[PDB]
Amino acid sequence: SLFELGKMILQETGKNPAKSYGAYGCNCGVLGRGKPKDATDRCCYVHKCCYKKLTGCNPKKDRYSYSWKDKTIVCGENNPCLKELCECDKAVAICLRENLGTYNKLYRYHLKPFCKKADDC
Amino acid sequence: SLFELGKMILQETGKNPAKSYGAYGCNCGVLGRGKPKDATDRCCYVHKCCYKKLTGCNPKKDRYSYSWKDKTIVCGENNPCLKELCECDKAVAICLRENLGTYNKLYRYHLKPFCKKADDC
Ligand SMILES: O=C(O)/C=C/c1ccc(O)c(O)c1
Ligand SMILES: O=C(O)/C=C\c1ccc(O)c(O)c1
Ligand SMILES: O=C(O)/C=C\c1ccc(O)c(O)c1
Ligand SMILES: O=C(O)/C=C\c1ccc(O)c(O)c1
């Protein structure tokens, strides 16, 4: 759920997730996907495509278990859909950390209606 | 859908909805309901309770038509769920504008896990 996703983002990037990633570019936050603005935005694009493959669980509401081990996110067994969801969330947090160097505050609170259409997943 | 909601909020308040209301207090944004911190927060509490009562449509995903007429949000639906959804959204947008006078930025990115339990809807 959003609780685990936000926690993972905080753990990997060190940033308040809502402020930095709650609405960034065309893909981070609500309102689905759009042509990404930069690498950070592309992380969220991939993340949203990852969510589409999920079958049998709700990525927003369903909580799942994971551990912080050797400073790595380790997804619990959970069940197949929840493990897959956990893995989607883990990947986006890692991707956001790797791209922190080009994070641009101008894309914070980017008006998502002014995004071109995303390609299909 | 969230698109119409965000547009209404912008139309009523004049404010970028993500920046001002994407994570405000215990109820504005994602992660359920909590005891409201102030009037702005209480608008979002009422909104979430409004959504809870809906049957037959998806408040997040389902699009609906509305118009801007004499600077008033005018819902353009006869389907009972979409009409009620539109009115839910219109109400929160109006409420947020009406409570800009007590809006407090200290409640932006309020630590949502640490709110008190909301009264039942
Ligand atoms: O949105 C802004 O205009 C600036 C706020 C901000 C931007 C970057 C940070 O790392 C941070 O803690 C706060
Ligand atoms: O995608 C990868 O594999 C690289 C990033 C990485 C590298 C080390 C870690 O412990 C981790 O969680 C992520
Ligand atoms: O997204 C917008 O609407 C533009 C940015 C913006 C600039 C100043 C504000 O006070 C505000 O809410 C938003
Ligand atoms: O416009 C105002 O009345 C006050 C300033 C203001 C308004 C909205 C913001 O998100 C912000 O950082 C500052």
Author numbering:
A (entry chain A), B (entry chain B): 1 to 121
The authors write:
A subgroup of PLA2s, known as PLA2-like proteins,is catalytically inactive due to lack of Ca2+ coordination related to natural mutationsof its primary structure; however, it is still able to induce a drastic local myonecrosis. The most studied PLA2-like proteins are the Lys49-PLA2s, in which the mutations Asp49→Lys and Tyr28→Asn impair the Ca2+ coordination. In this work, we report functional (neuromuscular-blocking and muscle-damage activities) and crystallographicexperiments aimingto studythe possible inhibitory effects of AA and CA onPrTX-I, a Lys49-PLA2 isolated from Bothropspirajai snake venom.
The inspection of the 2ǀFobsǀ-ǀFcalcǀ electronic density mapof the PrTX-I/CA structure revealed the presence of four CA molecules establishing hydrogen bonds in monomer A with Lys15 and Arg118 and by water molecules with Ile82 and Lys100. In monomer B, CA molecules establish hydrogen bonds with Lys20 and Arg118 by water molecules with Gly15, Asn17 and Ser21. In the PrTX-I/CA crystal structure, four CA molecules interact with the protein.
